[PDB]
Amino acid sequence: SLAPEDGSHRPAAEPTPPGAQPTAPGSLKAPDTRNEKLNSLEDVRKGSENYALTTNQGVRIADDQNSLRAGSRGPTLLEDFILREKITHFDHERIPERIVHARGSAAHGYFQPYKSLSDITKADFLSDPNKITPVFVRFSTVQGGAGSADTVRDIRGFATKFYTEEGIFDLVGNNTPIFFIQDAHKFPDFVHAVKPEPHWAIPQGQSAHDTFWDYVSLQPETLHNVMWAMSDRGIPRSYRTMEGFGIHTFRLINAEGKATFVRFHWKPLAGKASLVWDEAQKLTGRDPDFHRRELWEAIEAGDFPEYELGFQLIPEEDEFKFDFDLLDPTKLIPEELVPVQRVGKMVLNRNPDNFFAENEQAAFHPGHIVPGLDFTNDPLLQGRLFSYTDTQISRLGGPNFHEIPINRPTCPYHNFQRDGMHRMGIDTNPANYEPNSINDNWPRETPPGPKRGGFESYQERVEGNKVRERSPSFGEYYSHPRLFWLSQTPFEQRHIVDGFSFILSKVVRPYIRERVVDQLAHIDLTLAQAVAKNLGIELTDDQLNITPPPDVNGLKKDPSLSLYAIPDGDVKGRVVAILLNDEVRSADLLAILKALKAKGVHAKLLYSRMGEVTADDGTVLPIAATFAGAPSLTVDAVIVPCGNIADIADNGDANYYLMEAYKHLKPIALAGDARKFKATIKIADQGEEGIVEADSADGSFMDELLTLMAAHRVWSRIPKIDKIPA
Amino acid sequence: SLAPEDGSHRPAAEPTPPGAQPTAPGSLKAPDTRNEKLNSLEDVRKGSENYALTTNQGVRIADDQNSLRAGSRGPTLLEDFILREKITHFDHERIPERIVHARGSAAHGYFQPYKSLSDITKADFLSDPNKITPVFVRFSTVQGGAGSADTVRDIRGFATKFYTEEGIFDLVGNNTPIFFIQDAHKFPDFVHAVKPEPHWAIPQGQSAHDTFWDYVSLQPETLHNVMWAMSDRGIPRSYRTMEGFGIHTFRLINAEGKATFVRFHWKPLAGKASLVWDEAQKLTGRDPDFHRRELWEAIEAGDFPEYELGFQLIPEEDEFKFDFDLLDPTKLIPEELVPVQRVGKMVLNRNPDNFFAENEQAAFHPGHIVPGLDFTNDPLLQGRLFSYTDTQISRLGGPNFHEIPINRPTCPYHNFQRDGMHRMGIDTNPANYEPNSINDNWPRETPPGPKRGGFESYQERVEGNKVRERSPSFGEYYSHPRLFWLSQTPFEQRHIVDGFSFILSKVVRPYIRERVVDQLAHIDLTLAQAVAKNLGIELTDDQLNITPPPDVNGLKKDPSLSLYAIPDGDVKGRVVAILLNDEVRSADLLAILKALKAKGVHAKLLYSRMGEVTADDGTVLPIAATFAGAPSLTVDAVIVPCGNIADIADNGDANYYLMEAYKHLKPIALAGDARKFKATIKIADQGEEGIVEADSADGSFMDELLTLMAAHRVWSRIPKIDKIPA
Ligand code: HEM
Ligand code: HEM
């Protein structure tokens, strides 16, 4: 017995805020959170408490501290099968990481539709609002390895496995509505150009290198998704506060056999929110696990990530009605033209028990569709269908990867496939082929039908010659980049310019920077000039005269493309740093902590050391972290209560905490003598918008702070931060 | 043609300083740098210029931009074998990363001894000062994955593969002279506890988490290497500026059969130097590839990493003459007791061509010894012998990993082994067994002897019962930690206290913190109390009265255990940031660059934008990076020349650059009106040691700066940095 006698080693099995308790496996933290998939995993969950330590063959071990040797200082013997089994298993623990999206974080949850969609699709999981479908979701970055940092600038992956009654459906999307390239044949070229360069394997998690921009400059189709990656969409505050998209047009097929084109969306119910670049890049150093951590702790707190599935629907007769090709994955469909129809809600409400077994071995593949859905001829989608099946054969060790417990359907599966590495299922069917008589032909084919039918493809007409040729309808590269740009707020446009400027500054070969700047001038001359100025580049008269590309079906902006143009802020689940001193005004702290609790906003109490401090009235305040240990990067706002300010006023760490929070546009509130910190951040006497200040933390101080938190960041401060040295 | 007209896409094939040219594959950057191993890889080097693009079967491709489809908007066809080959290969790119030391950076080079060692060993590679042995060396961290950052706090690996005329010898060592654990049976326990925790797979690259300190607190044998990890040894400046050690006692065997015990050492000819923690941690975010980059760029510049191989030698009759067991890998052999004898020099002088083919696939294993060496009963080394061969079977895909080109011997190898996956060698021998008559028994066994003999194990006497038992002589855990602690300078001690305080503050369960402080009180009460104070823990009276452990064979200190107590500074290869303005004084720049060139120190010219600025005499200066893009973290010292200082005086980024460099203890030099920057870092008019200042940047100014750089950092400034907000 090595556990403390007070039982403090074990976290409470009830929701608790971030940092209040050590994190735990989801079945120990939330044993009563259940769904059909989590219940079906019971057969493979292994406990531990009260069991003897054994080999994998069930033999009890007496001494797990020592190898068998001839004499206690002698050589180790070959006959030590206990040492060799333990070291052999350790020696073979790693499997290949995913070829892209190697870094990702996952959780269990469930999905329910708001109404039956049987008029447009026979998909069983969308047939009935009382039908609950378990889900497993994995969020990821794209370029870096499984040990790379979370808050890099990158596209994010948003992969959902729906365990439906008619089959697994994987919706394998990203957090932007288009991809970089048009045909799958290019995907190894593009991914090779953005990955670390092959001679020295640098840089990790970054597009800021020459090969990426070389490919971009030569492949203008990439420019649309580049614009999105360079914007603050490339640096989300959390997986909870980004959008998701299936990117491709797919089809829905109803029981009458009618096809409707569809594009899939996820809307974050917590709102859209991103970091700023310097903060994101700093955070890759101070907490490279920040999004992983935030996801897991939101779930343990009860702040479940929620997303609304929505569909943009286009009738078959309207395939050719747009200025762009529906099949072109580098083109978005503006919501002003085709609104997103709300379809259902997904809640992620339980973490995994074991990251390797459930997250790392999870396999998602966009070819996993169910009756009621079908594909289109999008030439990027068509090639993905080959790739995911193939990669999984090496990553997961063979063709029985669907037998790995996280990947198993919860519905029946029976067929004539046999053997392969790692085969779990023991088939008793006399027959392993069909047609057969010796088992009366079971398991049997099922005709298509309105419910529980076999899968049949939509009979789309194909006509043309066998060609390797890009459709001319795909040959337009600048109008969607321009629509995105014009849709952004002025501060979002500043961050895009700063994104391109910082990143192209890292391209070593200057002609590549000049080639990128030339492509920008085909998008928008204001963008191209602002980026050129930062790079010391002067546009030519020719460049200044390129005519802008056309509007997209008459649109000169679509506000749904901006993160911030339409307010959708939600504070629940956000976190505030409170900077303590050794004699805090206890009435400030009561008012601050209860107002944050009332809105589901978490707090972290910070000081110059660990332990406790004592408030004016004798209340013992437990310290969560130090100013250096939990820097401003990790919170959404900063509150300084009154008390003995001289305790911290000369603490370089406390001042720099506020300087960093201020630079990064975060709301700051200063009560009482904490206003002395105004000099640190150069705030005028009569104050400024985004700094909350009062004699005490009572009356309207917390409401004002919370209003700032709902707007996310103080964009109006952008021209004031250029001066502060932080 | 896509290349720019001027040929600027291609780096010059001559040595160039960091940033002057794009980096390149070693055989293209340095085609005249050769050794027997580099030449032998010629069979498998593949060029590219003037060749047609083909499938892997040699079929020329006409259109690599498109899949085959039925019509140009039609579905992709299964008969597209070009698309499927390209996507198959991409889908199967990844192999498992190494179970530990997955993040690493490698180069080729050569070794040669200073004099023959034939009196103590028959090893052929040590037999002749004029016989050069090629090497391949990989440096690494321990815990993080292949995509984690370089400048984490961790132990580092230093693995050298010597391609000798009598077989491959791999010296697989680390940068501290002990390990954390005593018996290989515990390695999976220790590794599991340090690695990301199994529920959520957090944290990457960091021992700052509960499981690791739980293990340490229950396994006091770990404390020695924990001390080294918590010191600035855990955060080296470069792989060129750290020590290497084989850790275990091995044997040398001479031609007369005499065994001598040996421990192996590498001494860095560039000197020992480490970062400070806040610098290291921020650099994981701003350049997570810093050590990989710095190594590759030093080699491209001609600043070849050089190390001296050194042996501590103990006669067989002196095995038991110390206070500690020589076979205990948690114990070091103080150089005050047993001096390191210099043996030879290793120079790393060429980078690889392809990081995956040569670095990722390299296999090092400490069981690869040659005649003239042998093992001892060290029970950590005994289990390593099993593990490396085993793990390479899955990581590298089968038992023919020695035919992967980097791993091949350059000396003859012939035997009766056959087959296995990806067998390259085609054996012509009629026999695949011995004894045989049908091939007159070839290849034949070779008796041992003085040179070119077969391997025979030294006939150590073994006497004991078959036991799983730790030698009693290993059960002492505090005297070597205490020796190490007392051997450190006062600032090194402060950084150890700060390393423990920062890390244990991140441990969530407070009783694990308390149990580690209790361990520290068994080492040194001053250390234990300074950590306790930062953690809000009060030592009990019993803890205050714990008797210090005994001195190590009478030693109260050994200065060879400190990074800095004995100067060994070398400025060649270091880098200075020069902060430009838009009217630089050219006479300042002349003098600065001429003095830096004389000592082989590199310069990076920084400004508030890219492109060029023009000096007072019209010299056009290309800008390397912006003040934000290349922060002070990435240089050794900062110079600000005179010129139009108003251009940069109120730039936040330039002021912050100086404040960060100051906080991180780096030399700063300010010429002429650049002295106006003294106010941002609060230097008095009379000036301060570590800040060089004058009316212009003459010979005297540069000599003082280069003097400061030779002592690496300005330790005397430590008391002044806590009040700077940076
Ligand atoms: C719209 C464009 C695409 C999107 C939205 C997309 C999305 C994703 C996501 C989210 C993952 C990670 C799934 C997980 O969390 O495990 C992924 C992995 C993968 N993607 Fe795609 N992807 C796209 C295009 C492609 C293309 C064109 C190919 C190849 C033809 C491809 C090949 C792969 C492979 C090989 C993996 C790793 C799968 C595994 O190991 O299980 N992706 N992609
Ligand atoms: C003195 C203590 C040890 C030192 C100095 C040491 C050093 C290293 C180094 C430097 C590497 C990376 C080599 C490379 O760059 O590829 C490595 C890899 C490894 N080490 Fe050790 N190690 C030690 C103890 C152990 C123990 C006790 C075991 C297991 C019994 C072990 C198992 C491994 C394994 C499995 C690898 C992966 C090798 C591969 O995949 O090729 N290590 N170690």
mmCIF file with all atom_site columns, N, CA and C in Angstrom, chain A residues 367-385:
data_model
loop_
_atom_site.group_PDB
_atom_site.id
_atom_site.type_symbol
_atom_site.label_atom_id
_atom_site.label_alt_id
_atom_site.label_comp_id
_atom_site.label_asym_id
_atom_site.label_entity_id
_atom_site.label_seq_id
_atom_site.pdbx_PDB_ins_code
_atom_site.Cartn_x
_atom_site.Cartn_y
_atom_site.Cartn_z
_atom_site.occupancy
_atom_site.B_iso_or_equiv
_atom_site.pdbx_formal_charge
_atom_site.auth_seq_id
_atom_site.auth_comp_id
_atom_site.auth_asym_id
_atom_site.auth_atom_id
_atom_site.pdbx_PDB_model_num
ATOM 1  N N  . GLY A 1 367 ? -14.811 6.756  -47.721 1.00 0.00 ? 367 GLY A N  1
ATOM 2  C CA . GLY A 1 367 ? -15.530 5.723  -48.434 1.00 0.00 ? 367 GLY A CA 1
ATOM 3  C C  . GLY A 1 367 ? -16.559 4.980  -47.593 1.00 0.00 ? 367 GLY A C  1
ATOM 4  N N  . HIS A 1 368 ? -16.493 5.119  -46.273 1.00 0.00 ? 368 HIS A N  1
ATOM 5  C CA . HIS A 1 368 ? -17.448 4.414  -45.398 1.00 0.00 ? 368 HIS A CA 1
ATOM 6  C C  . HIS A 1 368 ? -18.737 5.156  -45.391 1.00 0.00 ? 368 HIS A C  1
ATOM 7  N N  . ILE A 1 369 ? -19.592 4.943  -46.396 1.00 0.00 ? 369 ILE A N  1
ATOM 8  C CA . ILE A 1 369 ? -20.930 5.588  -46.455 1.00 0.00 ? 369 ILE A CA 1
ATOM 9  C C  . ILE A 1 369 ? -21.981 4.489  -46.272 1.00 0.00 ? 369 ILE A C  1
ATOM 10 N N  . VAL A 1 370 ? -23.282 4.887  -46.187 1.00 0.00 ? 370 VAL A N  1
ATOM 11 C CA . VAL A 1 370 ? -24.346 3.939  -45.879 1.00 0.00 ? 370 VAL A CA 1
ATOM 12 C C  . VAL A 1 370 ? -25.466 4.214  -46.898 1.00 0.00 ? 370 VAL A C  1
ATOM 13 N N  . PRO A 1 371 ? -26.380 3.256  -47.023 1.00 0.00 ? 371 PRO A N  1
ATOM 14 C CA . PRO A 1 371 ? -27.456 3.544  -47.971 1.00 0.00 ? 371 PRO A CA 1
ATOM 15 C C  . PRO A 1 371 ? -28.211 4.843  -47.627 1.00 0.00 ? 371 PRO A C  1
ATOM 16 N N  . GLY A 1 372 ? -28.517 5.649  -48.643 1.00 0.00 ? 372 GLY A N  1
ATOM 17 C CA . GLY A 1 372 ? -29.029 6.998  -48.391 1.00 0.00 ? 372 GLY A CA 1
ATOM 18 C C  . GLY A 1 372 ? -28.002 8.070  -48.764 1.00 0.00 ? 372 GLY A C  1
ATOM 19 N N  . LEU A 1 373 ? -26.724 7.647  -48.992 1.00 0.00 ? 373 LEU A N  1
ATOM 20 C CA . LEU A 1 373 ? -25.644 8.602  -49.351 1.00 0.00 ? 373 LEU A CA 1
ATOM 21 C C  . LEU A 1 373 ? -25.034 8.062  -50.577 1.00 0.00 ? 373 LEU A C  1
ATOM 22 N N  . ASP A 1 374 ? -24.360 8.916  -51.335 1.00 0.00 ? 374 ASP A N  1
ATOM 23 C CA . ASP A 1 374 ? -23.523 8.459  -52.418 1.00 0.00 ? 374 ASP A CA 1
ATOM 24 C C  . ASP A 1 374 ? -22.496 9.536  -52.747 1.00 0.00 ? 374 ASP A C  1
ATOM 25 N N  . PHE A 1 375 ? -21.558 9.176  -53.663 1.00 0.00 ? 375 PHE A N  1
ATOM 26 C CA . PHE A 1 375 ? -20.432 9.988  -54.017 1.00 0.00 ? 375 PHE A CA 1
ATOM 27 C C  . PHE A 1 375 ? -20.781 10.845 -55.206 1.00 0.00 ? 375 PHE A C  1
ATOM 28 N N  . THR A 1 376 ? -19.891 11.735 -55.600 1.00 0.00 ? 376 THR A N  1
ATOM 29 C CA . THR A 1 376 ? -19.963 12.398 -56.894 1.00 0.00 ? 376 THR A CA 1
ATOM 30 C C  . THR A 1 376 ? -18.595 12.174 -57.537 1.00 0.00 ? 376 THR A C  1
ATOM 31 N N  . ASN A 1 377 ? -18.459 12.703 -58.736 1.00 0.00 ? 377 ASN A N  1
ATOM 32 C CA . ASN A 1 377 ? -17.156 12.672 -59.511 1.00 0.00 ? 377 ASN A CA 1
ATOM 33 C C  . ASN A 1 377 ? -16.130 13.753 -59.153 1.00 0.00 ? 377 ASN A C  1
ATOM 34 N N  . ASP A 1 378 ? -16.254 14.434 -58.001 1.00 0.00 ? 378 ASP A N  1
ATOM 35 C CA . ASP A 1 378 ? -15.163 15.287 -57.503 1.00 0.00 ? 378 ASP A CA 1
ATOM 36 C C  . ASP A 1 378 ? -13.844 14.449 -57.572 1.00 0.00 ? 378 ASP A C  1
ATOM 37 N N  . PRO A 1 379 ? -12.833 14.933 -58.337 1.00 0.00 ? 379 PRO A N  1
ATOM 38 C CA . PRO A 1 379 ? -11.694 14.138 -58.668 1.00 0.00 ? 379 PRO A CA 1
ATOM 39 C C  . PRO A 1 379 ? -10.703 14.013 -57.449 1.00 0.00 ? 379 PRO A C  1
ATOM 40 N N  . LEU A 1 380 ? -10.897 14.832 -56.443 1.00 0.00 ? 380 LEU A N  1
ATOM 41 C CA . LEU A 1 380 ? -10.137 14.706 -55.193 1.00 0.00 ? 380 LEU A CA 1
ATOM 42 C C  . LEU A 1 380 ? -10.829 13.588 -54.324 1.00 0.00 ? 380 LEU A C  1
ATOM 43 N N  . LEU A 1 381 ? -12.135 13.688 -54.149 1.00 0.00 ? 381 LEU A N  1
ATOM 44 C CA . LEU A 1 381 ? -12.910 12.631 -53.428 1.00 0.00 ? 381 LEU A CA 1
ATOM 45 C C  . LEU A 1 381 ? -12.634 11.264 -54.068 1.00 0.00 ? 381 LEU A C  1
ATOM 46 N N  . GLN A 1 382 ? -12.635 11.182 -55.392 1.00 0.00 ? 382 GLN A N  1
ATOM 47 C CA . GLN A 1 382 ? -12.591 9.889  -56.053 1.00 0.00 ? 382 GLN A CA 1
ATOM 48 C C  . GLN A 1 382 ? -11.307 9.183  -55.689 1.00 0.00 ? 382 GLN A C  1
ATOM 49 N N  . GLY A 1 383 ? -10.161 9.913  -55.656 1.00 0.00 ? 383 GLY A N  1
ATOM 50 C CA . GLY A 1 383 ? -8.925  9.347  -55.203 1.00 0.00 ? 383 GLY A CA 1
ATOM 51 C C  . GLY A 1 383 ? -8.812  9.060  -53.733 1.00 0.00 ? 383 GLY A C  1
ATOM 52 N N  . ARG A 1 384 ? -9.438  9.879  -52.860 1.00 0.00 ? 384 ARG A N  1
ATOM 53 C CA . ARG A 1 384 ? -9.466  9.521  -51.439 1.00 0.00 ? 384 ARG A CA 1
ATOM 54 C C  . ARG A 1 384 ? -10.055 8.170  -51.270 1.00 0.00 ? 384 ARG A C  1
ATOM 55 N N  . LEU A 1 385 ? -11.074 7.815  -52.081 1.00 0.00 ? 385 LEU A N  1
ATOM 56 C CA . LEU A 1 385 ? -11.688 6.491  -51.802 1.00 0.00 ? 385 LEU A CA 1
ATOM 57 C C  . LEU A 1 385 ? -10.690 5.311  -51.867 1.00 0.00 ? 385 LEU A C  1
#
